[PDB]
């Protein structure tokens, strides 16, 4: 054997071409894996064709893979058929690609940044089968680190600076110990609502929790929990999505543009 395959072809040239064929197959494989969610696409192409043309692009979809959930929570198929969901919005113009304007109060529309899918109405579970996100009042073995302030008792302040409530309890993740939610006693109504840690900016000196997402008045409409001591995956999405809607809807100037 030798390095020269022909007068021009050599082993290194063959090796690099061999990689291109493998890499092409790898990209096709990866794109097919990418398409296990959200495909076939929601398209006008399908709509005018009466559903006779499924928009998948290239490569086409893969055969459904099986996710067996722990604790007999069920089995999900990664490529799955999903029922169409109506949107609480209307197009701002009739051309394709035009955005939609939410209907009613945008913070309550469940559209745009306030939209969320309906997840399972079951709590995420620890390896031992207990609910994962729970208040500190039921996860008695958990505690706040000594060097960090206790969130409980802190004043919750909305985006406008007005006081929204106080922190009654802290919800922790029992698998990876960390704060995920802050239970707020709303100043107006008194009904407890959850506040995700991702929307909470701590002011350690002032003992204040600043929520730039929504105003103090918006806290009254935060989606509530069925059971007081646990939260389902469905409820988690509903709560987080509501605060996210405030990043665009809470104040009129947040819609933009800047100039």
């Amino acid at each position: 054997m030798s390095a020269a395959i022909t007068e021009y072809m050599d082993v290194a040239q063959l090796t690099i071409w061999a990689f291109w064929f493998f890499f092409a197959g790898l990209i096709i494989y990866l794109r097919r894996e990418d398409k296990r969610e959200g495909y076939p696409l929601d398209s006008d192409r399908t709509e005018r064709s009466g559903g006779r043309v499924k928009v998948v692009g290239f490569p086409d979809l893969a055969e459904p893979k099986t996710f067996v959930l722990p604790h007999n929570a069920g089995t999900v198929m990664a490529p799955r058929v999903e029922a169409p969901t109506s949107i609480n919005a209307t197009p701002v113009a009739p051309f394709p690609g035009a955005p939609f304007e939410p209907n009613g109060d945008p913070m309550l529309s469940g559209f745009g940044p306030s939209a969320s899918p309906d997840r399972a109405k079951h709590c995420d579970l620890t390896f031992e089968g207990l609910p994962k996100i729970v208040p500190l009042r039921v996860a008695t073995d958990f505690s706040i680190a000594e060097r960090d302030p206790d969130p409980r008792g802190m004043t919750v302040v909305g985006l406008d600076g007005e006081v929204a409530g106080t922190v009654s309890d802290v919800w922790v993740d029992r698998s990876e110990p960390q704060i995920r939610y802050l239970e707020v006693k709303v100043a107006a109504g008194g009904k407890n609502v959850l506040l995700p840690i991702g929307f909470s900016r701590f002011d350690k000196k002032a003992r204040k929790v600043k929520v730039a997402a929504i105003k103090a008045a918006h806290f009254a409409n935060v989606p509530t929990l069925a059971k007081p001591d646990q939260i389902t995956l469905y409820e988690e999405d509903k709560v987080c999505a509501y605060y996210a809607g405030g990043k665009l809807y809470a104040t009129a100037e947040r819609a933009g543009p800047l100039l």
């Binding site: 949107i87 113009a93 665009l248 933009g256 543009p257």
Partner: protein, 277 residues
């Protein structure tokens, strides 16, 4: 066409500039003001590169070979002024278009982030890559005093630029910021393989097993290296490693020539000449 869950997210507003003028989608892409600006910045820059390839360095050497196409910066004698189009001026125009396209891409990402109500980590992270490019073609050439210090626009020709810039300091491996940046690049790749492996091995376990848990994830690397950073923190670490690699790479090149002209191994003479030894 949108994803089957995407329609409920295609909301009006959230633009930085333009309001409703360009607030629409073209196929999957969001356009906005900076989609229009970015696209025609890129389109012009791409066409000028093709035009730069059409005339080549000269008519004899002109080539459409994708490896050999090269739009070169001006000669150093042009300083920080503008050069004639066929003598590096085209490179200067393409560089301006590239900056316009890259920044518009970042700003379009900001508008998308506002629409979706997510953190601005992605455009912030992309700014580091843009900053590295700006260091290479703007900050460093200005510090050196000539636009000709920028790298040529060519798939292989800019490797010759990297090679020769490195050998302008006789052994570029000894650049301390370069060593730090490579360490971050190598660690990031290791962390990425680890994170990709752990997620895949947990959600695609052995046959006959259910999907594993976050407890398995922490246990696995505790069992291997005695520590688990956590599901959230690995993404902090991956972002930190990638951004630190680019930051230190930008530092390493901007000190190579503007703030250090000697061979890089000689820089370590401060340590060798410590009076302790």
């Amino acid at each position: 066409a949108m994803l089957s869950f995407e329609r409920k997210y295609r909301v009006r507003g959230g633009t930085l500039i333009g309001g409703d003028l360009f607030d629409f989608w073209v196929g999957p892409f969001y356009v906005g003001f900076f989609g229009v600006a970015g696209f025609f910045f890129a389109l012009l820059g791409v066409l000028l590169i093709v035009w730069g390839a059409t005339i080549g360095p000269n008519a004899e050497l002109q080539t459409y070979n994708i490896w050999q196409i090269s739009i070169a910066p001006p000669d150093l004698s042009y300083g920080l002024g503008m050069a004639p189009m066929t003598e590096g001026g085209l490179w200067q125009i393409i560089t301006i278009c590239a900056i316009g396209a890259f920044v518009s891409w970042a700003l379009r990402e900001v508008e998308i982030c506002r629409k979706l109500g997510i953190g601005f980590h992605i455009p912030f992270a992309f700014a580091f890559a843009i900053g590295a490019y700006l260091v290479l073609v703007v900050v460093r050439p200005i510090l050196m005093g000539a636009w000709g210090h920028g790298f040529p626009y060519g798939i292989l020709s800019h490797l010759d630029w990297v090679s020769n810039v490195g050998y302008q300091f006789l052994h570029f491996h000894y650049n301390p910021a370069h060593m730090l940046a490579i360490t971050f690049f190598f660690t990031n790749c290791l962390a990425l393989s680890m994170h990709g492996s752990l997620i895949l091995s947990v959600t695609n376990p052995q046959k006959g097993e259910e999907v594993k848990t976050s407890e398995h994830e922490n246990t696995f690397f505790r069992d291997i290296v005695g520590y688990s950073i956590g599901a959230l923190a690995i993404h902090r670490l991956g972002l930190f490693l990638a951004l630190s690699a680019v930051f230190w790479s930008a530092v390493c090149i901007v000190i190579s020539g503007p703030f250090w002209t000697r061979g890089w191994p000689e820089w370590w003479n401060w340590w060798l000449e410590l009076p302790l030894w």
